[PDB]
Design a protein around this nucleic acid. Structure first.
Lengths: 66, 234, 304, 64, 124, 49, 180, 52, 175, 51, 133, 171
RNA sequence: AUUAAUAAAUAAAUAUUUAUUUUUCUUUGUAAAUAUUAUGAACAAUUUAAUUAACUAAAAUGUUUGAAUAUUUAUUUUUAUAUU
């Protein structure tokens, strides 16, 4: 997997990282470092934490530790 | 345990055994595999779970929409014991015993059966009473003592029926989980008695007109006589 | 237990047995040496496999000619048998036979005959003569065809093959008879031959049975369950007949009890005697009137 | 039923209440324990001399 | 058996000490001692009854129970079914299929993923 | 009906005749007639006693 | 124990690779099972008393995170040991045989008897002869961990004009050495 | 065994021998639908001509 | 005529509507389902399953550059007895092992030689007796057996073949 | 390492033993019932099926 | 522990030649007498060549080697089918021995004709020369 | 037992039909999906369709399971340059039909190309996907949506780095 | 299988019950007693000759060249492995 990641980096350095290339690199690194099985959707974490990206106005805005 | 007798239920029901039925079962509602036609695998935890949860809600259990009953309420549990004792021993026999050992054989056996039934009912209701100790009421605790007295069972404060544990070798008793069995019945009942005595003391301390004066006087006299009869003080 | 290629050592032991049968006693002894080494290393002390391989090694030594070595090995085998617990009846019988043969080779005819007689008494006093054919006695009843495939109605299983202890003792008694004839003794030969005959008679008797359906039977294949069961053998039946081996009947778990022990019946909460349960009571006034005193007379009969 | 039919074992639970009775139910201590009614022969009427005594000089042994 | 401890805990045997099918009493007399010697841990619960259940039950470590019928079964059959109760753990009823041969799926080297061998290409 | 038989392999499923090594009905009749004629001639080889 | 070979260099280079978890492909009951140190399998019935410490003799393959040994057909020096947890019968399969013509119905119940076995340990003690060339059948006298025994070169030559050309990195990416 | 885009209709009778295994000389499918519904015609094998 | 009335009424709960409500309809449907499932199991299920396994192995081989055809032939040639199910399992869960097998097949490694035929030792032809001792052929066979015993595993009997062969002298007693 | 007593259908699907004529002749003590008084073994039973 | 045998005696032909020596290879082409067709061996043919009777589970180690063994080395029991397979192998040996004995007895009695084939084959096949004399 | 509602989603319903790329089902998994670029210049149309379908349906993965619909997206470019062996361009028919009596449409690959070449490629991909899975609508449909078609060399998927798809013919 | 009708060995088929260890390399279902027995072809040709399956897995079956293109004869391009 590390050899594959190195080849991917060598391919993508010249033309700049793409969204799919970055996603594949993240998946490869996670697989390399994993010691267990991931049974949850990867996009679930992003869906939950999208409140860190989308900004809410007013006093109703959400911040860590409400 | 869902569709049958549960935590504080009195009726004894073996869900696997098809007792109380007029028909030989032809269709098994909870079926997971076609092989269960000849290999139902009942008794196994998962398949038994499927079957019991497929069973409909009987009178003991209640449906998700029907309003349940607060069976875990001390104010209901105590009068249940009082009614049990009343049914077991008639008013005439209770009056005769209070006035008075010269009793008929039928009356003696009736008293013994009443004591046995009261012990079984206490065993069944013990978890609910233990859970409901916290938010009970002084009147209901006094009623607990009165019901014990009426049933004629002397609580094990440290005739008598709670003091002796039921016979049976420990290697054959039903230890299966999920069934509300109380093997240390005398110890649990003694702990419950101590807890209710302490709760009565706390309620009196918290409580500390002619109507209220008379209520306090009668309550004190009751508490005193009932605790003296059961062999307790304060 | 330490790991040992018991499969390979069993191959060697089988090869040694083949050499014994073929008369290559030196080769059998050489193979048994390795087998005994392996078993001694593997199994714990006073083990059935160890004593058995020592028996085989003693036999190989005796056949080769090392009579003293064979005698020492069989003596150690007997010591191990004494030390062990619940030794195999067949194994001890074979050990006694081997000891007798070794003593005969040495020239101790009297001691060999004594060993044979000891084996005979041991088997007679601690052997079941019907257990071998317990499941083989009702096999003839399986057969459902008479014109063809009727060999199943006469299927025969030899006790010499299905009870090795019997064969061992038979051979030991034959050798004892031969020794008695060589010595010139008559009473010993007569008694040993008679005991051998009685042993074979016991085996046959346990094997005996009558014939069920003879001609062809169509269908009724579910009768096989009845045909093959734990059918008691004649010896077991005679030993544990219902009267000699009485059945313990505890009245605590029974309702009806003898007249004198009417109080030892299953206890009841509070029971009262109503009547003798006379079915005619239901009929009418005259029918009931014709039985008024029956209960009183029965009570007087069962008084005390 | 029939031994060979699946109906003979289609029932797998509920026959026995796992909780034993406190009156007469007991355990098997070992071979030294003498169990009531136990007998190696298939006696459909397991009687003994106490149940139905025999009127004869001797118990009918195979020796006689 | 799991980790040296038998999954079966107790075996209930209901029988009539008299006036009943001999099979159960004969089993008690003949085969039961051998089973008890082999598995002393299992608790034998003999239940005398006037109308016996004609079945043998086995209560296991997880509280489940497995019952076998013995209406007219022979003592040998009763013994065999008792040994079956001892052997089985009474936990699962999976089929014997190629998929189900391996209970839990495992990988020592590591499972296959799309990006494994993906960037490896043909050579000479 | 047709006599169904317990199979021991798919070759028995493919098999049509239970005894392939047996002559068909007409050949059976021919062979039986020839055998009976030969036996009769052998019996009559000697004169009529 | 560990790998052995007359070549000390090859022995010491390969011994560290065996350390770690191992998997084994074993043949049993006319079925092949891939098992690990803590895997439970259901083999066809084995006349083995429950709770018995058993061993699997014929092993087709062994391997781990860093090595793989194959058998042609079998292997030696492989100690695959398990414990016989259960002897039971799996889920019943019902075969209902009937024909529209004749009024005969047959109901066959096949509960496939099986033995459930939990593998407790896997060990390997190989005896290597020497390095073996792949692109040639000869086996080398000298083992050089610092040099690939079979070097590999890229495919593109320019002669094949209508060749499906991949990205240059994948097309010519060199490989490292897995022994240093 | 498939749609016309993969198996032409005249190829249906490919298990039989003869001219039917040769591609017909005239196809009348794309243009129009003839009243008689003949879709293929083979080269005249003498005074005889084959139609499908 | 026997039908699985009691056996199928039990699972009649697994159907819908009319079949589940009316005994006859449910029993007929269950009988038909059982018969069709039996036929499928005995004549098509194995074919479908093994086709799926074949396709998985073929896809793994394609990813590694090979295919099912050459892979199967080379496995046969190299005498690697991995059933297609085992090959699929190895490819899915042990990609490195599957790649190693493919590399073995690709390489010009000589496949194992064919099994040897039993050879009669010269000791069998050696005369015995020449004109207390053991037959030389029997001694050779015993030595081979002891060698197999020792090589089967790391037993504690010792690696001394001569010592093992001389075992019987240990039990022998000098007169 | 005794072999396990694993039930087979030939020895498990077995019924209790009903005394036969040989057993009752050998030990008459077992002829305890009219049920034990069985007819000759040649009598298979009332005919079933159609010839 | 594990076992791997191709022969009853456990001996095997040298699989790995000396270092630097060109290794021997099998005959990839089928055993057909004619030079054409030039077909490579099938997987089943390779199984036959390597010793398995066409199938993995018919003959060879997969059929002759015990599938299990006790951890302490105690071997497995003799199954009924195992005994039947051993009897089948003995039956093949008996067939071979009896055929050889029949041929030898015919040779000794003088029944083996000096002519190559029977009358039917001789009058059907021209390849057999004429042995008239 | 399972019950598929008679009230299905219909092409005439305002709710409309879904796109399985944006759907979320137990049998849909786009996590392991990859993106390939297939340049169909000078490649026979049936061969291109088969090669694309192999990746689209997911049969090229060792973890392939018929129930699970997982496959890699394939961007087919230069479909205009796709080649047919000989006179097939005008001698290969495409046949469809409506419920009306006349109903039948017989057209040529030339007409299909002149209308939309991507339509012809879609037809052949559909033929392959039906050849392998025909019994389920979801299986028949989802791989086709996984497939991407473009007649020119310009596609908007440059943000996914579709790796070129390299294969070899049977010859 | 099938012969109405004077001294001619024998109807067969199916089913039920039952019977005979004869030698030759191998192999081989012969016989008796008993019950039942319309499931029905017209010509021509030739002829002493022509719906069954125990489970798991395994498993080997499967559009040119005696023309074409062209001009007033010359050109053109004529094994495997693997899947029930």
């Amino acid at each position: 997997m590390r050899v594959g990641q190195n080849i991917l980096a060598e391919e993508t350095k010249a033309t700049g990282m793409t969204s799919m290339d970055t996603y594949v690199n993240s998946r490869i690194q996670s697989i390399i470092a994993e010691n267990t099985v991931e049974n949850v959707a990867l996009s679930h974490w992003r869906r939950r934490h999208m409140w860190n990206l989308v900004r809410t106005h007013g006093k109703l805005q959400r911040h860590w530790g409400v | 345990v869902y569709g049958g007798s549960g935590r504080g239920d009195l009726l004894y029901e073996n869900p696997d055994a098809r007792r109380h039925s007029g028909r030989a079962l032809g269709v098994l509602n909870g079926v997971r595999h076609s092989s269960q036609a000849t290999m139902p695998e009942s008794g196994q935890l998962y398949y038994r779970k499927l079957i019991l949860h497929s069973r409909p809600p009987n009178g003991s259990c209640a449906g998700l929409q029907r309003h349940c009953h607060d069976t875990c309420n001390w104010s209901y549990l105590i009068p249940s014991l009082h009614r049990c004792a009343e049914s077991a021993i008639s008013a005439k026999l209770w009056e005769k015993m209070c006035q008075l050992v010269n009793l008929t054989q039928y009356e003696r056996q009736r008293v013994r059966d009443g004591q046995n039934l009261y012990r079984y009912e206490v065993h069944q209701r013990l978890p609910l009473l233990e859970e409901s100790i916290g938010w009970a009421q002084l009147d209901d605790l006094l009623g607990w003592f009165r019901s014990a007295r009426r049933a004629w069972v002397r609580l094990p404060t440290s005739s008598s029926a709670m003091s002796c544990r039921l016979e049976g070798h420990a290697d054959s008793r039903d230890t299966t989980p999920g069934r509300n069995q109380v093997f240390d019945t005398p110890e649990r009942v003694e702990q419950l008695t101590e807890a209710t005595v302490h709760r009565i003391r706390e309620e009196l301390q918290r409580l500390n007109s002619a109507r209220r004066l008379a209520r306090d006087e009668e309550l004190s006299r009751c508490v005193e006589e009932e605790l003296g009869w059961h062999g307790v003080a304060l | 237990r330490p790991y040992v290629p018991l499969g390979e050592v069993a191959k060697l032991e089988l090869q040694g047995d083949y050499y014994m049968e073929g008369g290559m006693f030196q080769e059998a002894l050489e193979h048994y040496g390795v087998v005994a080494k392996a078993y001694n290393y593997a199994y714990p002390e006073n083990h059935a496999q160890r004593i058995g391989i020592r028996i085989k090694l003693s036999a190989a030594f005796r056949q080769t000619g090392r009579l003293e070595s064979s005698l020492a090995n069989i003596e150690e085998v007997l010591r191990m048998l004494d030390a062990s617990t619940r030794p195999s009846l067949e194994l001890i019988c074979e050990a006694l036979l081997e000891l007798g043969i070794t003593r005969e080779a040495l020239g101790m005819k009297r001691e060999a005959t004594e060993a044979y007689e000891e084996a005979l008494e041991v088997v007679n006093s601690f052997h079941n003569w019907g257990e071998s054919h317990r499941m083989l006695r009702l096999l003839p009843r399986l057969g459902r065809r008479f014109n063809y495939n009727f060999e199943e109605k006469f299927v025969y299983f030899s006790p010499f093959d299905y009870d090795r202890t019997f064969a061992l003792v038979d051979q030991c008694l034959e050798r004892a008879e031969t020794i008695f004839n060589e010595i010139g003794d008559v009473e010993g030969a007569i008694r040993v031959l008679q005991q051998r005959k009685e042993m074979i008679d016991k085996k046959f008797f346990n094997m005996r049975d009558f014939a069920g359906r003879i001609h062809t039977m169509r269908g009724h294949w579910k009768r096989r369950a009845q045909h093959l069961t734990n059918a008691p053998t004649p010896d077991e039946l005679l030993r544990y007949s219902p009267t000699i081996h009485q059945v313990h009947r505890d009245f605590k778990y029974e309702l009806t009890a003898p007249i004198g022990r009417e109080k030892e019946v299953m206890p009841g909460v509070n029971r009262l005697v109503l009547d003798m349960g006379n079915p005619y009571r239901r009929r009418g006034r005259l029918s009931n009137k014709m039985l008024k005193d029956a209960d009183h007379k029965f009570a007087n009969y069962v008084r005390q | 039923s029939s031994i060979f039919s699946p109906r003979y074992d289609w029932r797998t639970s509920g026959v026995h209440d796992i909780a034993p009775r406190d009156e007469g139910d007991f355990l098997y201590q070992g071979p030294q324990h003498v169990l009531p009614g136990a007998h190696p022969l298939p006696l459909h009427h397991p009687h003994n001399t106490i149940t139905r005594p025999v009127i004869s000089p001797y118990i009918p042994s195979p020796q006689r | 058996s799991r980790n040296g401890e038998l999954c079966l805990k107790k075996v209930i045997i209901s029988y009539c000490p008299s006036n009943g099918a001999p099979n159960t009493r004969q089993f008690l007399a003949t085969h039961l001692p051998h089973f008890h010697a082999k598995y002393p841990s299992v608790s034998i619960d003999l239940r005398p009854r006037l109308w016996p259940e004609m079945a043998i039950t086995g209560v296991y470590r997880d509280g489940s129970e497995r019952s076998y019928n013995t209406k007219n079964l022979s003592p040998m059959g009763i013994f065999l079914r008792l040994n079956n109760l001892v052997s089985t753990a009474n936990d699962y009823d999976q089929p014997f299929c190629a998929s189900h041969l391996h209970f839990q799926r495992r990988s020592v080297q590591g499972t296959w993923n799309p990006w494994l061998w993906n960037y490896e290409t043909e050579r000479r | 009906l047709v006599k169904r038989h317990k199979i021991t392999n798919n070759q028995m499923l493919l098999m049509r005749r239970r005894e392939p090594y047996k002559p068909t009905m007409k050949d059976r009749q021919e062979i039986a007639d020839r055998a009976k004629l030969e036996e009769f001639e052998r019996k009559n080889a000697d004169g009529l006693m | 124990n560990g790998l052995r070979c007359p070549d000390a260099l090859i022995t010491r280079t390969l011994n560290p690779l065996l350390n770690g978890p191992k998997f084994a492909v074993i043949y049993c009951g006319n079925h092949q099972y891939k098992v690990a140190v803590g895997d439970v399998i259901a083999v066809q019935r084995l006349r083995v008393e429950i709770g018995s410490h058993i061993a699997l003799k014929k092993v087709l393959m062994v391997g781990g995170p860093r090595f793989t040994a194959i058998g042609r057909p079998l292997l030696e020096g492989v100690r695959v040991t398990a414990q016989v947890e259960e002897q039971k019968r799996m889920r019943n399969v019902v075969s209902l045989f009937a024909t529209p013509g004749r009024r005969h119905v047959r109901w066959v119940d096949a509960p496939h008897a099986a033995t459930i076995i939990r593998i407790c340990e896997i060990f390997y003690s190989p005896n290597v002869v020497g390095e073996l060339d792949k692109y040639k059948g000869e086996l080398l006298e000298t083992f050089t961990p610092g040099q690939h025994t079979n070097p590999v070169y890229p495919v593109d030559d320019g002669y094949d004009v209508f060749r499906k050309k991949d990205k240059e990195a994948m097309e010519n990416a060199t490989t490292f050495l897995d022994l240093l | 065994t498939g749609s016309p885009t993969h198996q032409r209709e005249y190829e249906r009778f490919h298990h039989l021998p003869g001219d039917v295994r040769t591609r017909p000389q005239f196809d009348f499918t794309f243009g129009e639908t003839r009243a008689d519904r003949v879709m293929f015609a083979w080269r005249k094998r003498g005074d005889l001509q084959l139609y499908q | 005529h026997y039908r699985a009335k009691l056996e199928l009424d039990r699972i009649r709960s697994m159907l819908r509507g009319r079949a589940r409500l009316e005994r006859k309809v449910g029993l007929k449907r269950l009988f038909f389902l059982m018969r069709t499932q039996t036929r499928y199991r005995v004549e098509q299920q194995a074919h479908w399953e093994r086709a799926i396994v074949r396709k998985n192995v073929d896809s793994a081989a394609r990813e590694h550059g090979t295919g099912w055809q050459h892979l199967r032939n080379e496995l046969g040639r190299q005498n690697v007895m991995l059933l297609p199910r085992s090959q699929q399992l190895l490819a899915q869960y042990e990609p490195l092992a599957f790649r190693a097998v493919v590399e073995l097949c690709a390489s010009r490694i000589p496949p194992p030689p064919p099994p040897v035929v039993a050879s009669v030792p010269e000791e069998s032809y050696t005369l015995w007796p020449p004109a207390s001792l053991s037959h030389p052929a029997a001694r050779v066979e015993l030595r081979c057996g002891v060698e197999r015993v020792l090589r089967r595993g790391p037993s504690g009997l010792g690696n001394n073949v001569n010592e093992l062969i001389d075992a019987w002298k240990e039990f022998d007693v000098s007169p | 390492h005794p072999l396990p007593v694993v039930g087979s259908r030939l020895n498990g699907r077995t019924t209790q033993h009903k005394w036969n004529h040989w057993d009752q002749y050998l030990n008459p003590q077992i002829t305890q019932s009219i049920k034990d008084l069985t007819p000759t073994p040649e009598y298979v039973g009332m005919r079933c099926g159609h010839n | 522990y594990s076992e791997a045998r191709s022969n009853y005696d456990g001996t095997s032909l040298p699989a790995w030649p000396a270092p630097g020596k060109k290794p021997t290879y099998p005959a990839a082409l089928s055993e057909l007498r004619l030079p054409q067709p030039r077909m490579r061996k099938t997987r089943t043919e390779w199984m036959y060549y390597h010793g398995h009777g066409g199938c993995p589970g018919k003959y060879g180690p997969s059929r002759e080697i015990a599938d299990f063994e006790y951890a302490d080395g105690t071997p497995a029991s003799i199954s009924g089918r195992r005994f039947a397979f051993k009897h089948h192998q003995d039956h093949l040996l008996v067939q071979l021995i009896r055929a050889a004995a029949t041929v030898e007895r015919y040779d000794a009695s003088g029944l083996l004709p000096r002519i190559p084939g029977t009358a039917e084959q001789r009058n059907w096949d021209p390849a057999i020369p004429l042995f008239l004399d | 037992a399972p019950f598929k509602s008679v009230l299905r989603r219909h092409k005439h319903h305002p709710e409309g039909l879904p796109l399985y790329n944006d759907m979320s089902k137990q049998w849909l998994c786009r996590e392991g999906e990859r993106w390939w670029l297939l340049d169909a210049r000078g490649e026979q149309l049936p061969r291109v369709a088969a090669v694309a379908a192999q990746y689209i349906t997911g049969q090229h993965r060792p973890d392939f399971t018929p129930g699970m619909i997982t496959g890699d997206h394939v961007v087919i470019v230069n479909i205009k340059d796709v080649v047919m062996v000989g006179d097939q361009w005008i001698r290969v028919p495409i046949t469809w039909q409506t419920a009306y009596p006349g109903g039948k449409y017989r057209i040529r690959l030339t007409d299909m190309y002149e209308r939309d070449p991507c339509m012809l490629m879609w037809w052949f991909l559909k033929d392959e996907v039906n050849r392998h899975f025909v019994r389920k609508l979801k299986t028949r449909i989802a791989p086709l949506e996984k497939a991407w078609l473009y007649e020119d060399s310009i596609h908007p998927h440059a943000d996914k780095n579709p790796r070129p798809l390299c294969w070899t013919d049977p010859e």
